Design an enzyme around this catalytic site. Structure first.
Site, mmCIF file in Angstrom:
data_model
loop_
_atom_site.group_PDB
_atom_site.id
_atom_site.type_symbol
_atom_site.label_atom_id
_atom_site.label_comp_id
_atom_site.label_asym_id
_atom_site.label_seq_id
_atom_site.Cartn_x
_atom_site.Cartn_y
_atom_site.Cartn_z
ATOM 1 N N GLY A 1 20.988 75.519 -41.048
ATOM 2 C CA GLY A 1 19.997 76.250 -40.279
ATOM 3 C C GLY A 1 18.596 76.124 -40.844
ATOM 4 O O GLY A 1 17.886 77.128 -40.998
ATOM 5 N N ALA A 2 18.184 74.892 -41.146
ATOM 6 C CA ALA A 2 16.940 74.646 -41.864
ATOM 7 C C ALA A 2 15.817 74.127 -40.978
ATOM 8 O O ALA A 2 14.787 73.683 -41.498
ATOM 9 C CB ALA A 2 17.181 73.662 -43.005
ATOM 10 N N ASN B 1 22.429 78.955 -45.544
ATOM 11 C CA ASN B 1 21.300 79.706 -45.022
ATOM 12 C C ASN B 1 21.501 80.141 -43.577
ATOM 13 O O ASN B 1 20.763 81.006 -43.093
ATOM 14 C CB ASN B 1 20.018 78.864 -45.161
ATOM 15 C CG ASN B 1 18.846 79.437 -44.384
ATOM 16 O OD1 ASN B 1 18.340 80.519 -44.702
ATOM 17 N ND2 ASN B 1 18.392 78.704 -43.372
ATOM 18 N N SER C 1 21.060 89.292 -47.611
ATOM 19 C CA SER C 1 19.934 90.134 -47.238
ATOM 20 C C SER C 1 20.035 91.425 -48.018
ATOM 21 O O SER C 1 21.094 91.755 -48.548
ATOM 22 C CB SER C 1 19.893 90.444 -45.738
ATOM 23 O OG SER C 1 19.132 91.631 -45.520
ATOM 24 N N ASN D 1 22.275 99.410 -43.208
ATOM 25 C CA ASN D 1 21.131 99.738 -42.365
ATOM 26 C C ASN D 1 21.631 100.217 -41.010
ATOM 27 O O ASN D 1 22.641 99.720 -40.491
ATOM 28 C CB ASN D 1 20.190 98.540 -42.179
ATOM 29 C CG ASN D 1 18.898 98.922 -41.507
ATOM 30 O OD1 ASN D 1 18.487 100.094 -41.519
ATOM 31 N ND2 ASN D 1 18.248 97.934 -40.896
ATOM 32 N N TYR E 1 25.983 93.086 -39.220
ATOM 33 C CA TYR E 1 25.241 92.221 -40.131
ATOM 34 C C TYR E 1 25.479 92.644 -41.568
ATOM 35 O O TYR E 1 25.714 91.798 -42.442
ATOM 36 C CB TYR E 1 23.751 92.316 -39.789
ATOM 37 C CG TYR E 1 22.774 91.341 -40.420
ATOM 38 C CD1 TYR E 1 22.907 89.973 -40.259
ATOM 39 C CD2 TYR E 1 21.681 91.814 -41.146
ATOM 40 C CE1 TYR E 1 21.971 89.092 -40.827
ATOM 41 C CE2 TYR E 1 20.755 90.950 -41.709
ATOM 42 C CZ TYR E 1 20.904 89.594 -41.543
ATOM 43 O OH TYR E 1 19.969 88.740 -42.091
ATOM 44 N N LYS F 1 26.936 90.132 -44.479
ATOM 45 C CA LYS F 1 26.164 89.841 -45.686
ATOM 46 C C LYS F 1 26.827 90.450 -46.917
ATOM 47 O O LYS F 1 26.689 89.926 -48.028
ATOM 48 C CB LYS F 1 24.734 90.388 -45.561
ATOM 49 C CG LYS F 1 23.820 89.696 -44.567
ATOM 50 C CD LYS F 1 24.202 88.246 -44.361
ATOM 51 C CE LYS F 1 22.996 87.425 -43.918
ATOM 52 N NZ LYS F 1 23.322 85.973 -43.761
ATOM 53 N N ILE G 1 10.935 89.708 -44.848
ATOM 54 C CA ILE G 1 10.171 88.469 -44.958
ATOM 55 C C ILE G 1 9.423 88.237 -43.652
ATOM 56 O O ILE G 1 9.905 88.588 -42.566
ATOM 57 C CB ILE G 1 11.118 87.302 -45.288
ATOM 58 C CG1 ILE G 1 12.070 87.727 -46.397
ATOM 59 C CG2 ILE G 1 10.353 86.082 -45.722
ATOM 60 C CD1 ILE G 1 11.390 87.930 -47.712
ATOM 61 N N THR H 1 23.595 88.017 -58.027
ATOM 62 C CA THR H 1 22.884 88.320 -56.801
ATOM 63 C C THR H 1 21.432 88.601 -57.170
ATOM 64 O O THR H 1 21.155 89.542 -57.926
ATOM 65 C CB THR H 1 23.504 89.536 -56.152
ATOM 66 O OG1 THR H 1 24.797 89.195 -55.644
ATOM 67 C CG2 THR H 1 22.627 90.009 -55.054
HETATM 68 N N1 LIG Z 1 13.493 87.081 -42.863
HETATM 69 C C1 LIG Z 1 14.113 88.236 -43.067
HETATM 70 O O1 LIG Z 1 13.502 89.281 -42.959
HETATM 71 C C2 LIG Z 1 15.605 88.174 -43.429
HETATM 72 C C3 LIG Z 1 16.277 89.097 -44.186
HETATM 73 C C4 LIG Z 1 17.168 88.601 -45.099
HETATM 74 C C5 LIG Z 1 17.269 87.211 -45.210
HETATM 75 N N2 LIG Z 1 17.120 86.497 -44.172
HETATM 76 C C6 LIG Z 1 18.142 85.443 -43.837
HETATM 77 O O2 LIG Z 1 17.466 84.219 -43.665
HETATM 78 C C7 LIG Z 1 18.314 83.307 -43.005
HETATM 79 C C8 LIG Z 1 17.460 82.597 -41.963
HETATM 80 O O3 LIG Z 1 16.099 83.074 -42.019
HETATM 81 P P1 LIG Z 1 15.274 83.706 -40.800
HETATM 82 O O4 LIG Z 1 15.236 85.197 -40.917
HETATM 83 O O5 LIG Z 1 13.919 83.054 -40.747
HETATM 84 O O6 LIG Z 1 16.160 83.480 -39.467
HETATM 85 P P2 LIG Z 1 15.790 82.643 -38.120
HETATM 86 O O7 LIG Z 1 14.310 82.738 -37.964
HETATM 87 O O8 LIG Z 1 16.767 83.098 -37.062
HETATM 88 O O9 LIG Z 1 16.266 81.240 -38.708
HETATM 89 C C9 LIG Z 1 17.752 81.194 -38.831
HETATM 90 C C10 LIG Z 1 18.184 79.777 -38.596
HETATM 91 O O10 LIG Z 1 19.634 79.627 -38.673
HETATM 92 C C11 LIG Z 1 20.002 78.893 -37.515
HETATM 93 N N3 LIG Z 1 21.411 79.077 -37.237
HETATM 94 C C12 LIG Z 1 22.044 80.217 -36.818
HETATM 95 N N4 LIG Z 1 23.328 80.064 -36.666
HETATM 96 C C13 LIG Z 1 23.567 78.745 -37.021
HETATM 97 C C14 LIG Z 1 24.752 77.960 -37.079
HETATM 98 N N5 LIG Z 1 25.953 78.428 -36.768
HETATM 99 N N6 LIG Z 1 24.627 76.667 -37.478
HETATM 100 C C15 LIG Z 1 23.406 76.218 -37.785
HETATM 101 N N7 LIG Z 1 22.232 76.855 -37.760
HETATM 102 C C16 LIG Z 1 22.380 78.125 -37.376
HETATM 103 C C17 LIG Z 1 19.011 79.421 -36.511
HETATM 104 O O11 LIG Z 1 19.334 79.507 -35.149
HETATM 105 P P3 LIG Z 1 18.656 78.669 -33.985
HETATM 106 O O12 LIG Z 1 19.069 77.195 -33.901
HETATM 107 O O13 LIG Z 1 19.341 79.570 -32.988
HETATM 108 O O14 LIG Z 1 17.110 78.814 -34.108
HETATM 109 C C18 LIG Z 1 17.737 79.139 -37.277
HETATM 110 O O15 LIG Z 1 17.474 77.743 -37.440
HETATM 111 C C19 LIG Z 1 19.547 84.141 -42.504
HETATM 112 O O16 LIG Z 1 20.837 83.985 -43.130
HETATM 113 C C20 LIG Z 1 19.063 85.622 -42.558
HETATM 114 O O17 LIG Z 1 20.297 86.372 -42.345
HETATM 115 C C21 LIG Z 1 16.295 86.976 -43.174
#
Ligand SMILES: NC(=O)c1ccc[n+]([C@@H]2O[C@H](COP(=O)([O-])OP(=O)(O)OC[C@H]3O[C@@H](n4cnc5c(N)ncnc54)[C@H](OP(=O)(O)O)[C@@H]3O)[C@@H](O)[C@H]2O)c1
Ligand SMILES: NC(=O)c1ccc[n+]([C@@H]2O[C@H](COP(=O)([O-])OP(=O)(O)OC[C@H]3O[C@@H](n4cnc5c(N)ncnc54)[C@H](OP(=O)(O)O)[C@@H]3O)[C@@H](O)[C@H]2O)c1
Ligand SMILES: NC(=O)c1ccc[n+]([C@@H]2O[C@H](COP(=O)([O-])OP(=O)(O)OC[C@H]3O[C@@H](n4cnc5c(N)ncnc54)[C@H](OP(=O)(O)O)[C@@H]3O)[C@@H](O)[C@H]2O)c1
Ligand SMILES: NC(=O)c1ccc[n+]([C@@H]2O[C@H](COP(=O)([O-])OP(=O)(O)OC[C@H]3O[C@@H](n4cnc5c(N)ncnc54)[C@H](OP(=O)(O)O)[C@@H]3O)[C@@H](O)[C@H]2O)c1
Ligand SMILES: CCCCCC(=O)CC(=O)SCCNC(=O)CCNC(=O)[C@@H](O)C(C)(C)COP(=O)(O)O
Ligand SMILES: CCCCCC(=O)CC(=O)SCCNC(=O)CCNC(=O)[C@@H](O)C(C)(C)COP(=O)(O)O
Lengths: 73, 248, 237, 248, 237, 73
Positions: free
Chosen positions: E13-14, E91, E143, E150, E156, E160, E189, E228
């Site tokens: 998911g990069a 990720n 997370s 939460n 979720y 996690k 973030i 962690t």
């Molecule tokens: N930013 C925050 O506040 C927060 C909190 C804790 C940590 N994170 C963690 O950061 C990670 C991603 O960051 P983000 O918040 O920026 O999320 P995001 O904007 O939704 O990016 C997540 C990515 O993962 C992809 N993805 C989802 N399911 C997938 C699968 N089965 N196979 C491949 N790719 C897949 C996405 O979906 P699409 O192809 O649908 O775009 C997208 O490319 C997650 O694990 C999230 O739980 C986020």
């Protein structure tokens, strides 16, 4: 069998004399487990195809390894 | 004993083991216990008959805790009979241990679905039937290895760890209606789930347990009873370790 | 009520507040509570009278929990009177809040010596007197601050975090003797805008802390040693 | 390497052991390191001369970290020479292990005063000299047994646990001026403090450490370096376990 | 920069967000990043071009991280191209928030199967390919929710919290092979009233998460497994 | 010595024959440590007053226990 001897003996740092047919892998040749799973998988790199769990469960000592291979050939 | 403001309790997977001993303990404190079973009722009815002969109120009820419709109807019947459900205990759990490289997505899901999903339905239906009555206590039986991890239990640990994090969120969700969620993370208890195990690996544990013994199912049970009782009325989102010192 | 194998208990700093409410609770379950006080007798004997008046057993005793001789000798007196000692609650605590840059080493020490060192002599004499009977339960009263920290409480966070990690080590030491050691971390116990951070939307009542302590001394927690039990309404999970 | 916005670092008790290896590592990343010693300067100067000959900037400075006036003057001299102090590492620590019943309030205070109080002064003086410059990173070397407890170390564990809780509060206090406080809780490192110990008790540990070895002082050091460097710029009030899996 | 013994890395998911910013970071330190995407190529190849344009190595690859065959086969393709695999970052994540009473079992499963099961196939193939080389590092992106919970995120929080406890168990399993497993728990973030709960008074930037991940894959953390690492500005200590 | 024999033998579930003067407490009679600290403290319940740490450190086997007592009498 001879090449089976050399495979398990490389696979876990023991010379071929250790490999008597009914030396166990764990009580005798001295191995944890991934050691035996990764050996069995390594033995399926001989293309004995994916010998089943239900026949690998009963593997304990090198002779069963000569069985199950020549079975699934 | 210990005081309870509630009256009845549902205990998924209560036929044998820690689930059984939870039912004996909560029953002998004058609660009505609903012993759940999934398959053979000969042990659950035997438990129910043991408890009534002692003079406690008991019952049995059939459902697969991992089955949403089967779970929801089960509680509805409990509400219909008793006019509400005060206390839920998500005890139902399975174990399937394998080195990850030999482990299969079936073996991962088998544990997740039975250990985690079942608890989700429980907690959820627990909010529903308890929200209007502004009272409730729920206790999710987790495990030490949800806190620590362990070799060969990547599926079990995944599910217990989810249960502890999920319970925290439910406790947020039900906190304003005085619905409290807590987890119990036991150490190694002398029950059905780990009975079949190498003595070489069992005395291995004992010598790592400061209290120098395996815990009694009755001991997990009385800790669950405290967490459901009223003595714990300010305790929510907590995790109570019952592991004899094995992990701190 | 709750099952106790032991008979008596010593509660440091029990003349008022949470300590009084642990004495009140633990007595109503049938134990002889040894309230101590450091200064004002008047209010400490009020409590002894209030309990004895309901037909419970209760005794006062005067010592500073920071003073090694006073407290060692205390416990020796209680053993000599009641035959032995079964339970101990290290409840004695003080607070002197300040931002760090405004804090003098004296202001640190006053809290460490009086919240943590006191808990040390307690636990250490617990091990000394409870070993021959191979039975006991000790509970150290910490705070949510020993887990989360807090701005303006680097001295208190230190003493309560100490007390928690020290307690775990005592729990290792006395397990050889069926002597259990555990900590309780209360949250905010009874401005009022701090209630919005508590999920239960209220300040816990001291009885809610006393019953947690009672459960940790009672036989129900007979497989629980080394644990930290949060009584914080969900403030910190 | 790893980026640092700061320039100099003070490392209490840096003459030997993990403190030494922290100084080598932070020096070879182009920081100016102030190796502290309490008693004999023959090892600290030898370290300083090792580091300059490699082409890094180093220095030595004498104080007892548990002595407030001696500590405060020490940092003042560091500020006077360099025009400010960017990074503090509270490494200074002592150990005295005894069963609690044979342990004495001297032995309790000896550890508290040297392991905990010293770190308090450090963090405090760390706020002072770093507040106006709106930048800073501090790292308190704690220990696994501040998180876990251990038999015979009721004084050491008391002090390490205080250090971890105290560091959390400093991180609150200095967070708005971009002053971050973190702890490192190492497992069992192959250094001076535990070198003299029974092989029966040492191989006892190794077989409990999943990575199947004692950690290198260089390995605690590079984790401290990450926590001080800029890569960790959003990390505060954290505790980084460097114990090879021994506790999770 | 930071020392890496290994050459390449797979980042599920990069194509965007934190995953893109781990790819960008890890490439700038000299690794060949294997970005994957699930749907939109266009933006995923934009990133591959942006990195290759700065003279880094980079490759895209298309698979669903929840789909066992797609992902097993992926890693097999990367091994066959680059000789082996050294690093993996689980990720891939999704979110579907709801109060519990409004949440259907499908709404739970959609998050569990896609945040936790994906992390499982990842770690499990990591163990499979990195064992012969006896070297590797895996980082699972969790997370703050997996630690605190939460309201409205029981699905979720579950996935996690799973991922964290699962990761610890993989860390036990691959230590026999110098294969390290660790988790990163980011806070918020980059409404904006939630900044008052963060001590650093700001929302962490995704690069602040990527560098934490890079440190956990790098050789500096060579004695850190099972840990962690909170990247939350102090939101949860 | 005879009453010293019976004290350590009660103190840790061993009969008096185990107590040969130079049987060690740990290599021979089988004891952890609190076992030896609580024994020594139990031996100071004979009122050998508070025999010092600097002389108890060297206690390993029962004969030293006969010393240090008849020293501090
Ligand atoms: N930013 C925050 O506040 C927060 C909190 C804790 C940590 N994170 C963690 O950061 C990670 C991603 O960051 P983000 O918040 O920026 O999320 P995001 O904007 O939704 O990016 C997540 C990515 O993962 C992809 N993805 C989802 N399911 C997938 C699968 N089965 N196979 C491949 N790719 C897949 C996405 O979906 P699409 O192809 O649908 O775009 C997208 O490319 C997650 O694990 C999230 O739980 C986020
Ligand atoms: N024992 C330990 O050492 C230990 C430590 C940590 C905590 N626990 C936890 O304690 C619980 C179980 O107690 P136990 O260890 O004594 O195990 P046990 O003897 O195997 O009892 C578990 C029970 O749960 C039932 N169950 C499983 N899935 C169910 C479902 N979907 N619906 C209804 N009932 C279901 C069982 O299934 P059947 O129809 O198959 O009988 C069985 O009656 C679990 O949550 C376990 O993970 C165990
Ligand atoms: N209530 C809360 O919000 C909160 C938070 C966490 C838990 N607790 C803990 O609860 C305990 C006491 O409860 P409280 O908040 O109600 O405190 P309080 O009102 O100050 O009562 C504390 C008691 O301890 C006594 N004391 C202090 N030092 C002593 C010593 N050396 N020897 C003997 N007695 C001593 C007191 O001092 P005087 O003789 O000077 O009256 C008083 O009797 C403490 O350990 C505190 O840290 C409080
Ligand atoms: N090694 C481990 O297994 C382990 C694990 C957990 C963490 N740590 C922590 O790592 C630190 C020490 O490193 P080490 O284990 O390698 O121990 P070490 O070799 O004994 O080094 C400790 C150093 O700290 C110095 N020191 C002590 N008190 C001081 C003071 N008041 N002022 C200035 N310097 C002082 C020493 O004193 P001298 O003048 O006496 O030389 C010595 O140079 C401590 O915080 C320890 O508690 C140790
Ligand atoms: C505390 C336990 C309490 C608890 O909650 C755990 C359980 O449910 S029983 C869970 C059983 N507990 C265990 O430790 C079993 C683990 N066994 C394994 O991982 C094996 O596959 C392993 C030996 C490593 C490899 O096999 P090879 O040698 O053939
Ligand atoms: C991980 C360690 C890393 C760490 O941080 C600990 C240290 O500082 S070295 C600290 C040394 N580590 C230890 O485990 C020493 C503990 N030893 C004792 O408690 C003894 O007094 C005891 C054997 C129980 C009783 O004595 P008897 O048998 O005569």
């Amino acid at each position: 069998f001879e090449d089976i001897q050399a495979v398990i003996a490389e696979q876990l740092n023991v010379d071929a004399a250790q490999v008597t047919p009914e030396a166990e892998f764990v009580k005798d040749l001295g191995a944890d487990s991934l050691d035996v799973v990764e050996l069995i998988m390594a033995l399926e790199e001989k293309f004995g195809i994916e010998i089943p769990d239900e026949q690998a469960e009963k593997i304990v000592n090198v002779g069963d390894v000569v069985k199950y291979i020549e079975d699934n050939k | 004993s210990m005081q309870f403001t509630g009256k009845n309790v549902l205990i998924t997977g209560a036929s044998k083991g820690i689930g059984a001993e939870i039912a004996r303990t909560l029953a002998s404190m004058g609660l009505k216990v609903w012993i759940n079973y999934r398959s053979n009722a000969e042990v659950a009815d035997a438990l129910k008959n043991e408890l009534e002969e002692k003079g406690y109120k008991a019952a049995v009820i059939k459902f697969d805790a991992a089955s949403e419709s089967d779970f929801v109807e089960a509680i509805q019947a409990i509400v219909q009979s008793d006019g509400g459900l005060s206390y839920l205990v998500n005890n139902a759990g399975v174990v399937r241990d394998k080195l990850a490289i030999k482990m299969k997505t079936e073996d991962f899901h088998h544990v997740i679905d039975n250990n985690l999903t079942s608890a989700f339905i429980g907690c959820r239906e627990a909010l529903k039937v308890m929200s209007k009555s502004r009272f409730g206590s729920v206790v999710n039986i987790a495990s030490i290895i949800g806190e620590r991890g362990n070799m060969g239990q990547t599926n079990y640990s995944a599910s217990k760890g989810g249960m502890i994090a999920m319970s925290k969120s439910f406790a947020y969700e039900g906190a304003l209606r005085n619905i409290r969620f807590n987890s119990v993370t036991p150490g190694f208890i002398e029950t059905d789930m780990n009975a079949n195990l190498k003595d070489e690996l069992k005395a291995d544990y004992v010598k790592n347990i400061p209290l120098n013994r395996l815990g009694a199912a009755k001991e997990v049970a009385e800790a669950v009873a405290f967490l459901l009782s009223d003595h714990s009325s300010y305790i929510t989102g907590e995790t109570l370790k019952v592991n004899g010192g094995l992990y701190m």
